[PDB]
Amino acid sequence: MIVLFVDFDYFYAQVEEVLNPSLKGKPVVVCVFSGRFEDSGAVATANYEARKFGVKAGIPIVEAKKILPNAVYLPMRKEVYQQVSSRIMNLLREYSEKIEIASIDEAYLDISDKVRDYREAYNLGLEIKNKILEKEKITVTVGISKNKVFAKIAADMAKPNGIKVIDDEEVKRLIRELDIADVPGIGNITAEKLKKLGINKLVDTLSIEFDKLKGMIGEAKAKYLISLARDEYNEPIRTRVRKSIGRIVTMKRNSRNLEEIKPYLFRAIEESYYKLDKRIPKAIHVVAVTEDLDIVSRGRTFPHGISKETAYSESVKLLQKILEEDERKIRRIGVRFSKFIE
Template identity: 55%
Template sequence: MIVALADLDYFFAQVEEIMNPSLKGKPLAVCVFSGRTKDSGAIATSNYEARKLGIKSGMPIIMAKKIAPDTIFLPMRKDLYKQVSSRVMKILENFSDRIEVASIDEAYLDITKKVKSYSDIMELGKKIKEEVKMREGLTITVGIAPNKVFAKIMADMSKPDGLGILRDNDVNNFINSLDIGKVPGIGKVLEDRLREIGINYLGDVLKVDFLTIKNKIGKAKANYLLSLANNSYDEPVRPRISKHKGRYVTLSKNTRNIEIILPFLKKAIDEAYNKIDGLPKSIAVVTIMNDLDIISREKSFPYGIDREKALQESLLLLKKILEDDNRQVRRVGVRLGKIYKSSTLDKYF
């Protein structure tokens, strides 16, 4: 399998620069205003000029304004970004018959059948970048590797406007030299736990007893790391079809206190259930952390679940998120999936 991750550089801010070329070269930050106060909210993304001044994604707006008051702070324009994203995804579809849209600014492409050699891979990566730049004016970073996780890491290492390719014969060295904290899905809490048992690099996973790792970070994460370390990870690129309903709410303040989060979680569940006709067979709790990173946990059921059951299960999923991550929660939400419409007597009369 050969996978490419196409990741648009500082997407929201870059779109604003294209819409208003006079912004180019000036420090610029796109903000998510929470509405609590005039300057409450966080930085969604910033261009590289603003980053040089110390502005980072997830930083409170009020703090960013103190650090770099001459920065241009713009509100997020979701509809505009969605339109641009949709056009970019259409471009990417020309390079693969299997594309998985991972977020508004990144997508995985299965290019296994499109390339036969390293030169083919290099050429395809360049064409993706050239096509997006020519048609939308956007720079995009492309990471290419034998699996989705390694492709994402290669993209992260190649930003901005880069092309990173992990060759098959370089995989072992890559695994042995990859800092465990750089592995997607390994937050600070899990990173610290792994370092406690001598795992500082991905390759170290193969040097530690699996049971020790499982007891430290849980079976699912242990299996995930093992599959990466022995290069057997093979999650396919899955085209996603949206079949879920979701609802998200902003907390009154950033917190890790479950008692404070619970009423907001219940509100999200109630509003999500009000939007569906039937019962969901899967539920996911989604948290947007204080730095705007998104973490989710999901559970499926053999039957549709009602609101009360959804709240019980959501609370357990929320606790799991907080156990695995030590950051504060800014927003919380739920996604209801596999919605099952029960038959009623009305259809027979």
């Protein structure tokens, strides 16, 4: 297997540079509000000219402006970013039938049907970079290796506007030398957890008794890290099929009033059924988040598919059960659907 990973560079701000080329080479900051329009918002992303002086993703725009008051600040245009992304993903599909779209700016390709060496993989990567630049004026970073994990790590090491191969020998080296915290799927927790078990590299997981790891981080992760460390990881490039689909919305205030909560619950159902599309669930859960941010949840499985009308009627019954069996005030409410037909 040869896997190629593509990560679009500083994507939202780069799209703004493409739609207004006069911006290129000057600081550009894309602002995100998350529906909270009474303030200045936050930096969604900034181009490298802005990052150079400390304007980085996540900081409040009021703080960014104290650093670069004369940068160009643009509110997010999510629908445009999504459209440009979708067009680029379509360009990538021409290079492989085996593609996994991981996010709005990330895709994996299994290119094993077209190349079986890294020199030609690199050439294919160059062609992809040129094609996306030609057609959409977007620069990207390409990572190439023997599996998804090292392909992503390769792109992380090479961005922006990069291309990097991690060949078989470099994989072996990284298994010994790469900080296990930089492995995809390992957050701040887990990382600290296995640092307390003496594990700092992928190779270290081979000198623990397995159940000790497993006990700390769980069976799935343990198997994951060990298979990486043994250089046996080979997960296919494929469209991920969800096991559940849902939506949980925040109410304007705490409530324990059924009639007050219902419109929110119904909104969650409508949004969920849009997401479901042609998928038909046989199970429904109602999920309540209490004011202290705990979860209370109740599910039902049917021997048949759930119509939207049954989703409405059953969700109220489940919510009624939640209200009867727990005394806490509810702040967020929604539904999750699972057990899909076919």
